[PDB]
Amino acid sequence: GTILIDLSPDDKEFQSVEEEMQSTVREHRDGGHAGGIFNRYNILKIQKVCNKKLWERYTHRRKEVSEENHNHANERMLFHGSPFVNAIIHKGFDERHAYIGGMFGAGIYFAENSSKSNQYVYGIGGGTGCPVHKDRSCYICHRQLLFCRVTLGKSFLQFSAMAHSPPGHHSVTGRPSVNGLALAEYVIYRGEQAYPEYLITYQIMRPE
Numbered sequence: 735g736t737i738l739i740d741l742s743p744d745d746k747e748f749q750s751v752e753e754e755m756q757s758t759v760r761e762h763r764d765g766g767h768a769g770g771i772f773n774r775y776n777i778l779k780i781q782k783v784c785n786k787k788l789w790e791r792y793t794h795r796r797k798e799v800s801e802e803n804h805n806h807a808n809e810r811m812l813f814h815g816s817p818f819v820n821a822i823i824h825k826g827f828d829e830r831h832a833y834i835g836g837m838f839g840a841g842i843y844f845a846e847n848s849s850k851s852n853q854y855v856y857g858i859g860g861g862t863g864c865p866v867h868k869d870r871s872c873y874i875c876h877r878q879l880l881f882c883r884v885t886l887g888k889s890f891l892q893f894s895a896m897a898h899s900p901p902g903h904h905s906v907t908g909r910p911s912v913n914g915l916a917l918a919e920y921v922i923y924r925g926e927q928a929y930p931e932y933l934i935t936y937q938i939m940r941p942e
């Protein structure tokens with residue numbers, strides 16, 4: 735039931751998504767090992783992900799969280815990178831998309847930094863890089879990320895350098911506590927708490 739609707743680059747919606755993607759690139763502590771060396775992207779395409787059933791699954795869960803948290807879903811737009819991007823957009827988020835080994839337990843992880851999600855496009859640690867060249871810093875091959883609507887509800891704050899949410903919380907927030915430039919990362923433990931709104935196709939660009 736999923737359809738992908740291409741956005742024109744002239745559309746304000748394309749432009750505001752491209753800007754969140756570009757403006758939230760940062761340097762990483764691995765010097766580019768996982769995700770490659772780049773300061774910006776070449777955005778090739780942005781598509782709206784349309785699936786009525788998956789949307790109703792999200793809004794239903796959203797209302798449940800909202801009603802457990804003084805009518806506040808605490809909804810964010812966040813990036814997700816995964817080798818399973820095509821299963822996600824067709825069947826929705828679930829336990830098979832969890833980062834079992836993540837620092838805040840087995841759950842589904844999202845980033846404010848687009849460059850952080852870029853590190854998982856080819857697997858944990860970047861895997862072996864692109865399928866074609868085996869290069870984690872490939873500048874040729876086309877990458878995809880999701881820009882997702884995520885319900886955090888009451889989020890457990892972890893200060894720092896599938897399972898269940900901590901009792902009385904709907905998510906975990908990984909607060910950056912050493913790298914002053916890092917933005918937060920977030921974990922949900924229910925796939926129904928994220929909806930993959932935008933499929934972004936891009937290349938990382940070689941710095942000049």
Ligand SMILES: O=C1N[C@@H](c2ccc(Cl)cc2)Nc2ccccc21
Pocket residue numbers: 813814815816817831832833834843844845850851852854857858919920
């Ligand atoms: O975009 C994210 N993708 C995940 C991820 C996705 C799929 C698999 Cl298999 C493993 C991990 N990890 C992240 C960790 C922190 C912030 C963002 C992300």
Ligand SMILES: [Zn+2]
Pocket residue numbers: 864865866867868869872873874875
């Ligand atoms: Zn490649």
